[PDB]
Amino acid sequence: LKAPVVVLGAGLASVSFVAELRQAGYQGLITVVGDEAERPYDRPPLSKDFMAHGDAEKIRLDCKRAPEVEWLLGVTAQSFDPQAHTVALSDGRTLPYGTLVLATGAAPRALPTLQGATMPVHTLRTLEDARRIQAGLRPQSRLLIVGGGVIGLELAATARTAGVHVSLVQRGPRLMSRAAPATLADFVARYHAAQGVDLRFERSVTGSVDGVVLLDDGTRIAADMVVVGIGVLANDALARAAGLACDDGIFVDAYGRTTCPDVYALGDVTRQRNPLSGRFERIETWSNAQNQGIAVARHLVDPTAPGYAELPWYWSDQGALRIQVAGLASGDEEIVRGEVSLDAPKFTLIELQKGRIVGATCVNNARDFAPLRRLLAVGAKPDRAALADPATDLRKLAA
Amino acid sequence: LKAPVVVLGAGLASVSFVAELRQAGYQGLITVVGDEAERPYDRPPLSKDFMAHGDAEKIRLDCKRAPEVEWLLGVTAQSFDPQAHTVALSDGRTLPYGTLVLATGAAPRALPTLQGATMPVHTLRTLEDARRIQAGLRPQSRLLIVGGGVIGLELAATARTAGVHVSLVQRGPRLMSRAAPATLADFVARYHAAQGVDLRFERSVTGSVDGVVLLDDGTRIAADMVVVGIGVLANDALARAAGLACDDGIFVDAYGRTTCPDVYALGDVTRQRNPLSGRFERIETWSNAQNQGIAVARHLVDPTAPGYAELPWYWSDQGALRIQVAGLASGDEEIVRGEVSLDAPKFTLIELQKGRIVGATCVNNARDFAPLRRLLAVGAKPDRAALADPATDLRKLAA
Ligand SMILES: Cc1cc2nc3c(=O)[nH]c(=O)nc-3n(C[C@H](O)[C@H](O)[C@H](O)COP(=O)(O)OP(=O)(O)OC[C@H]3O[C@@H](n4cnc5c(N)ncnc54)[C@H](O)[C@@H]3O)c2cc1C
Ligand SMILES: Cc1cc2nc3c(=O)[nH]c(=O)nc-3n(C[C@H](O)[C@H](O)[C@H](O)COP(=O)(O)OP(=O)(O)OC[C@H]3O[C@@H](n4cnc5c(N)ncnc54)[C@H](O)[C@@H]3O)c2cc1C
Numbered sequence: 092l093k094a095p096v097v098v099l100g101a102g103l104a105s106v107s108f109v110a111e112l113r114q115a116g117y118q119g120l121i122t123v124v125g126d127e128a129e130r131p132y133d134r135p136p137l138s139k140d141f142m143a144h145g146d147a148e149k150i151r152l153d154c155k156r157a158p159e160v161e162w163l164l165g166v167t168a169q170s171f172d173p174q175a176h177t178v179a180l181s182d183g184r185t186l187p188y189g190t191l192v193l194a195t196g197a198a199p200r201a202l203p204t205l206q207g208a209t210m211p212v213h214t215l216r217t218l219e220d221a222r223r224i225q226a227g228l229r230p231q232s233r234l235l236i237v238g239g240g241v242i243g244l245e246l247a248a249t250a251r252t253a254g255v256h257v258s259l260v261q262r263g264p265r266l267m268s269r270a271a272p273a274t275l276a277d278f279v280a281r282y283h284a285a286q287g288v289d290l291r292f293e294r295s296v297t298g299s300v301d302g303v304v305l306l307d308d309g310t311r312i313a314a315d316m317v318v319v320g321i322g323v324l325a326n327d328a329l330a331r332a333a334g335l336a337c338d339d340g341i342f343v344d345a346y347g348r349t350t351c352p353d354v355y356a357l358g359d360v361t362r363q364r365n366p367l368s369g370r371f372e373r374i375e376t377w378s379n380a381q382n383q384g385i386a387v388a389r390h391l392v393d394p395t396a397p398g399y400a401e402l403p404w405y406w407s408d409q410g411a412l413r414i415q416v417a418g419l420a421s422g423d424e425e426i427v428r429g430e431v432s433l434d435a436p437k438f439t440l441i442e443l444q445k446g447r448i449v450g451a452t453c454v455n456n457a458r459d460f461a462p463l464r465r466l467l468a469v470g471a472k473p474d475r476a477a478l479a480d481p482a483t484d485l486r487k488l489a490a
Numbered sequence: 491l492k493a494p495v496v497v498l499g500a501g502l503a504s505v506s507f508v509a510e511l512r513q514a515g516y517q518g519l520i521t522v523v524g525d526e527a528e529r530p531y532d533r534p535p536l537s538k539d540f541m542a543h544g545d546a547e548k549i550r551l552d553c554k555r556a557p558e559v560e561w562l563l564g565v566t567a568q569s570f571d572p573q574a575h576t577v578a579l580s581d582g583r584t585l586p587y588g589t590l591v592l593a594t595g596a597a598p599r600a601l602p603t604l605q606g607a608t609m610p611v612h613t614l615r616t617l618e619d620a621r622r623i624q625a626g627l628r629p630q631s632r633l634l635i636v637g638g639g640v641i642g643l644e645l646a647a648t649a650r651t652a653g654v655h656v657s658l659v660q661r662g663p664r665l666m667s668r669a670a671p672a673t674l675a676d677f678v679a680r681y682h683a684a685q686g687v688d689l690r691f692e693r694s695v696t697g698s699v700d701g702v703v704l705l706d707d708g709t710r711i712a713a714d715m716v717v718v719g720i721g722v723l724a725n726d727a728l729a730r731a732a733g734l735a736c737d738d739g740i741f742v743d744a745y746g747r748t749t750c751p752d753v754y755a756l757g758d759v760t761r762q763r764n765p766l767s768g769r770f771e772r773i774e775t776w777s778n779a780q781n782q783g784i785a786v787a788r789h790l791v792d793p794t795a796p797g798y799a800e801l802p803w804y805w806s807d808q809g810a811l812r813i814q815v816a817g818l819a820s821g822d823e824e825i826v827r828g829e830v831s832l833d834a835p836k837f838t839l840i841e842l843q844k845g846r847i848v849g850a851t852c853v854n855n856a857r858d859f860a861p862l863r864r865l866l867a868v869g870a871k872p873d874r875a876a877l878a879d880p881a882t883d884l885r886k887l888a889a
Contacts, residue, residue: 334743334744334745334797335743336735336741336742336743336747336749336762336763336770337763338763338768338769338770342735342741342749342770343735343749344733344734344735344749344750345733346733346749348735348749348750349749350735350741350742350743350745350747350748350749351743351747352751363735364735364736364737369737370737371735371737371741398733
């Protein structure tokens with residue numbers, strides 16, 4: 092850890108990082124460069140409570156645990172010179188660094204077919220996005236969402252609840268293709284359909300003409316607004332130009348090291364090792380953003396601390412469903428605790444691979460999720476009849 | 491570049507590297523650690539001329555351009571301590587380093603279903619492999635090859651030429667799945683079939699019983715020997731334990747930097763950026779091994795030198811076919827120069843993507859290959875009618 096410390100990006104990863112630095116004992120300079128002119132804020136309300144109530148001061152990140160940090164807000168880092176150890180800012184200034192940390196997150200993928208569209212076409216990543224979307228969402232408006240991921244589905248539920256007609260187009264055969272078990276996805280589809288979401292599977296957007304959307308089946312949807320949610324791309328441009336190893340994401344080891352000396356990276360912008368699959372992936376979860384930021388910071392202050400080791404997990408609030416997914420989506424067996432019914436949805440999925448717990452889903456069942464993550468974390472091999480038996484208490488099982 | 495320099499591995503990548511270091515001006519210590527007790531040798535003859543003539547002194551690498559290098563042959567590097575800057579050897583010694591270079595290549599993938607087989611089951615990576623295979627290959631023996639890659643096919647051609655009956659099992663629908671254009675693969679299949687190779691597509695090996703092989707269709711093949719050629723895995727174990735970023739291959743930037751300070755990597759062991767596809771891949775070609783070793787060495791001696799920039803390419807001698815493949819296997823158009831016939835095979839493929847040359851195949855046509863690689867290297871967009879016209883001279887076109 093060489094002073095001063097410069098962090099590029101001011102999302103949850105960056106805030107968690109600089110906070111931990113200060114908690115761990117680092118008392119030298121920290122400068123954070125954030126391109127949004129916004130007091131650092133959390134993103135998940137943007138599809139739920141913020142979209143509904145509109146209060147941005149309810150979603151700001153607590154910077155309290157990060158004292159003596161200069162936050163250059165509304166400034167874009169344009170390049171860095173890894174030899175000179177400087178960063179070049181959009182306002183003409185230059186920042187020196189001993190240690191440069193890239194926490195630049197990711198930006199929504201654009202839809203090429205709507206590239207020159209004549210109707211409102213938004214993505215949903217920022218406070219600015221949310222406000223703009225929120226403002227074309229009168230009740231009884233007609234909203235099209237492209238993409239069946241968690242963002243689209245969260246928005247869908249939040250919009251239906253308002254009284255918006257929602258139609259969702261998904262090019263695959265199922266929702267939540269990224270890290271959701273099939274069972275969960277079938278159910279999730281079934282829930283939103285029962286809420287009045289018009290689902291289109293196996294469909295692609297081919298273009299648009301005057302407030303109407305064209306699909307690859309020759310059909311048509313008329314929309315008052317279109318929200319695209321087909322995934323994100325890492326903001327790694329700076330890394331690519333300075334010569335770091337990248338492929339839609341900056342490669343880092345478990346200490347957050349890039350291939351460039353004195354340059355680290357964390358959060359959504361990173362491709363890292365998934366300890367379960369063994370493969371490198373861009374883990375774009377909230378918990379990763381925070382937990383990886385902390386791990387990397389902790390190891391910079393105390394090199395004897397371990398590298399980042401957390402198994403991946405996330406939640407997703409979609410209307411009445413509080414969904415929690417941990418680990419892998421499938422193994423060689425799935426055990427279902429409880430019943431899968433739209434009538435009072437509450438159930439638990441456990442995914443097993445040669446007897447070891449490798450994944451878990453809790454829908455409306457937080458009580459079960461935490462002990463499953465503990466059992467998942469130490470690759471436990473419990474009796475499957477006990478795992479299936481409703482009488483079993485999972486919290487107890489975990490000791 | 492900090493002295494002394496320790497290189498792990500003694501294949502073509504390592505030799506090319508240490509040679510360039512010395513040519514570029516580095517005159518400090520170089521120690522190479524090679525686990526095979528063999529004077530450094532080139533691998534491609536192992537499936538062609540060596541397999542036929544048996545002369546290992548015809549395939550040694552010229553170490554002449556690498557003076558004053560100590561080659562610890564027959565020694566395995568067991569671990570390295572990246573903090574202490576030491577390497578631990580299988581013979582009890584410890585090597586200090588300023589600069590550690592991992593050039594440990596890759597090892598053949600094993601076939602789980604033959605894991606406990608009772609008949610000769612070999613892979614073909616080493617001099618030792620070749621000799622052992624060579625010695626169970628009487629004319630009119632029956633050989634099974636699993637895998638339709640270049641190694642299997644090279645062996646197949648070399649064996650048929652001897653008078654061996656060859657049967658080849660491929661789990662995919664085509665040969666040469668890795669970086670071969672479809673057209674080439676259809677033809678290559680067609681050639682070997684006409685040479686008496688019994689091709690089995692869509693088939694898997696399920697197990698074995700007493701000198702007979704079991705496929706997923708319930709059928710059976712009797713073999714006097716089985717040579718498995720279903721790909722390789724990077725030898726990156728040392729890197730995984732020392733904390734470098736790996737996923738079947740060590741991630742390196744274009745200077746060969748890993749995520750660990752003072753530790754570089756090159757050749758088959760690396761996942762690197764493919765300048766055409768933009769993606770990271772394990773490029774396991776001969777030319778990469780040599781050219782990347784040189785680039786990395788050159789940049790260590792002179793940091794003003796550029797990073798490694800070569801577009802990928804390879805050749806493959808399969809009996810009567812001298813095949814040369816450069817770039818990507820497909821674009822939005824394929825142009826065929828000449829005719830595709832088993833009767834005197836000679837043709838050229840050019841792959842185009844939005845007008846730019848992105849790939850080329852020459853079968854028995856070396857004259858055309860070099861200028862295609864030049865045109866490929868600068869993403870040229872030539873008239874397609876001129877590219878198709880047999881009258882056109884490609885060498886001329888390249889200026
Ligand atoms: C609508 C929405 C809903 C979500 N809901 C969930 C959920 O249900 N569950 C869940 O697990 N996660 C969800 N996420 C939350 C999420 O995962 C976190 O927002 C994310 O992981 C944050 O990681 P980050 O800080 O690394 O990236 P970011 O939050 O994107 O931070 C990066 C910041 O750096 C900025 N930046 C980029 N380049 C530069 C530059 N050159 N100079 C200066 N600044 C730059 C970016 O503009 C950005 O503001 C949701 C996200 C969204 C958008
Ligand atoms: C049969 C065959 C045919 C081929 N034909 C072609 C062809 O037609 N065209 C083509 O483009 N390429 C072909 N190749 C050649 C090829 O691509 C090169 O052999 C390869 O790219 C060499 O790269 P390398 O030096 O990085 O790996 P390697 O040659 O595998 O060098 C690595 C060496 O380091 C050793 N090592 C590993 N770990 C340790 C350790 N811990 N300590 C000490 N030593 C260690 C390995 O045992 C190995 O000897 C062929 C290869 C084979 C085997």
